[PDB]
Amino acid sequence: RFKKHVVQHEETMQAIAQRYYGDVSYWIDLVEHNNLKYPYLVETDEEKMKDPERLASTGDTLIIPIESDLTDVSAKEINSRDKDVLVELALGRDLNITADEKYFNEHGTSDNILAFSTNGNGDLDTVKGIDNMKQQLQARLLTPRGSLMLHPNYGSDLHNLFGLNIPEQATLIEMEVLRTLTSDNRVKSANLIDWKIQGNVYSGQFSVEIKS
Amino acid sequence: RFKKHVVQHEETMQAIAQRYYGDVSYWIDLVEHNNLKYPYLVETDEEKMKDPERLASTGDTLIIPIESDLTDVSAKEINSRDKDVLVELALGRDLNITADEKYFNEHGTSDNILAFSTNGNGDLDTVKGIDNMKQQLQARLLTPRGSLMLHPNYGSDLHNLFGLNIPEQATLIEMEVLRTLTSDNRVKSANLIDWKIQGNVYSGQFSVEIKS
């Protein structure tokens, strides 16, 4: 996996490699990972006009590998394709089934909710990257734990938890949300920011550390 | 041994094996136990009227082996045809000797109290199922600890516990009854739910957990 960088004013190419790897000498590998020509960075943006794809300038974005994938030619090849789209390789692409967030949010835990839909024309709607991650947390959490017809212990126990509105029960809802959300490797961790018990409405908001 | 179950509205045969045994993969062997033709579970009873014995529909019972007997071919063959005769065979069959039910409850801890009887026509009466288990517990309780001509240390000291009706005697009687009831391995546990006194009369009741 990788890190983003933004090029700064008169930024020395070797300063990037030092600043994230300690030794200077890995800049030969970094510029091969980013398919640069010899002018690795340039002050003037008009010079980029000549060979845009193979010439970077101030404020442009570069891709920094982690140390282990530094010398892997295959990672160099793939990292030369997915330039500023590399996120898509970790989070993935999947089919869209959230046809209207105005619909299922008002009906909640039930059968016969979500459905495939079509964006544009002819091509079936494929939802990707961060937007795939939104769906793959949302569609997971709305499913009850026992539900799915292979690999059980999917889903959550959320539908059980409509007990008495008293504080302990609210913390139990927090716990099942936390447990359900940290269950997928794509998120590092989760924690609660705030919660608000109305007379019969639970409201609470949670952070999640998506990777990259 | 086995667990009982019933067919629910539009439940698929895949769903049952997955919920009880974990893996969905096991349904294939599980249909042979319930002797089912291809439409293994079908919603409609006028469709069960096609060939009633070889199908299950909504509201019908099913048999669910334990996982060790799932793969046994003998368990498959027996569960295929016996169906409801499972419980009787599994609790066993015996001659009925509760001929005078009103009477044996007037002279317990005295001998000569039980006797063969006749049901049906021209054949000694027999008892099976849960009734058999009750009858056997009843006889075991009303027999003194060393009075059967073989395998002694069978029975109870209930004939010995008659005393001043102070509570320690009542806990002693409770413990003897519980020991007597828990002697049979088929029963899981017993526990008292009430003990009650009426001068020179004891009264109380015990709940016993019989294996499925």
Next chain:
Amino acid sequence: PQSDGISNLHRIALRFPKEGGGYDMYRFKVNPENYTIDSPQRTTAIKTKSDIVIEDYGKDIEVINFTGTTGFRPVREADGLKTGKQKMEELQSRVSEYAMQGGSGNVSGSYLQFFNFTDDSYYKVHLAPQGLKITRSKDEPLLFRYEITLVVIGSLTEADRSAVTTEEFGNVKPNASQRVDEGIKELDKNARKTRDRNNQEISRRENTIYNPRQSTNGLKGNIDNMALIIGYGDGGVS
């Protein structure tokens, strides 16, 4: 029972085993000064580089320990008038009868029933390794204090291991094997030698709750009799 809302609590009682059949009991006139129950667990936790491993192996011995004295006043008994000194002497003699001829000779009872009417709990107990401890002190010239530790064999409601009955459906005794052995006993030396040879011959070329209803466990047993009585070879096979 306690002293609260309900009628007067019942003291703690001990039931010992009578040599001559039946049972003898001992109730404390004065409830113990201290009463401790230890119920540990046999489980060990060892962390690895980046995970925690927990393993358990059941419930541990539930150790019961309590300390009490005996009153100086006399009190009515079931037979006689026994003061605190006599009461404690009888307790000592009972423990010594249960302990001194436990490893030597023989004791009819296999265990001791410990009744906690005040705590509404019952258990089957055996003398601990620490054992009985009696002591008398300066600031108790007339009294006698006792300290006993116990180990719980198990719940009193359950039945004894040796007094348990299994399912035992169908015949338990394979009579086929019994008559096969009885018939083999009468066989002549040559018959037995030929049966050994036949057994070897079958053996070296292999790879290439008795109930005949709802079971196939007793299959070869019936064949062995039928092959002996009818005669497959001079002795038989299998």
Next chain:
Amino acid sequence: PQSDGISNLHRIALRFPKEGGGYDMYRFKVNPENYTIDSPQRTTAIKTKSDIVIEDYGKDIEVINFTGTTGFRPVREADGLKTGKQKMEELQSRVSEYAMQGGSGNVSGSYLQFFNFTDDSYYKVHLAPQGLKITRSKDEPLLFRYEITLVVIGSLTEADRSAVTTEEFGNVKPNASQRVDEGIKELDKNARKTRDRNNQEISRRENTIYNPRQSTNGLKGNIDNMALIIGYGDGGVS
């Protein structure tokens, strides 16, 4: 929250596992008298002849221990009117049932869940080897006391380690291996013998997560699947 003049006190609750799945909710009606939490470290110190060496391996298994007394006066319950003695007995019976059922190394379900509501913190815990020690001395005759010790497995915010759903992009269960194995099962003994000969010949000539896209690990599976649809020698290779 604690009693701080802004919110009322909130007392501790234990959420035990239920035999058929789901959970109990045992909540204490009087909070503990002592509450201790230990956080040991696996750091070790060794002293070399000319220097000290400090080495650490990270966090060690935490210990939770607390002690308290069940209230005396009757107090209404969310589905009953239960007294302190009934509450203590229910506790003892929950802990006995949890401990006894763990006789298969470790329960496959949950550990205990420990809602320490008073100060905001949540843990997953297991019975420590001290266990549930219950005592009642002469002082405070009508009040029970309980001593619990617990070891922390992890925060309750984090789901189980092994249960985490990995990325699993591409295909973890490739069909190439399966149909190769089926092919080789279907081959004749002479066919496989010749395949072994060809493999040995190739080995002599050596010298002198899976995805069909953007991955080389599954290269051999596509090649191993060949040499059976095409007769590359009497049997496949590798």
Next chain:
Amino acid sequence: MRRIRRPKVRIEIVTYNGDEFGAKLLGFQTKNSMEDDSSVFQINMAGDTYWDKL
């Protein structure tokens, strides 16, 4: 100043994943010696999983 050390062992296996095998590490020994004609090593594993079948 005293040195600080934070050991972090990895294990890789080739025929169950190696990273899960390395997680349940607890200790190991590696007897290597030119004096004798044989080098031998031992690994201690936790009892969380039934390694005998794997």
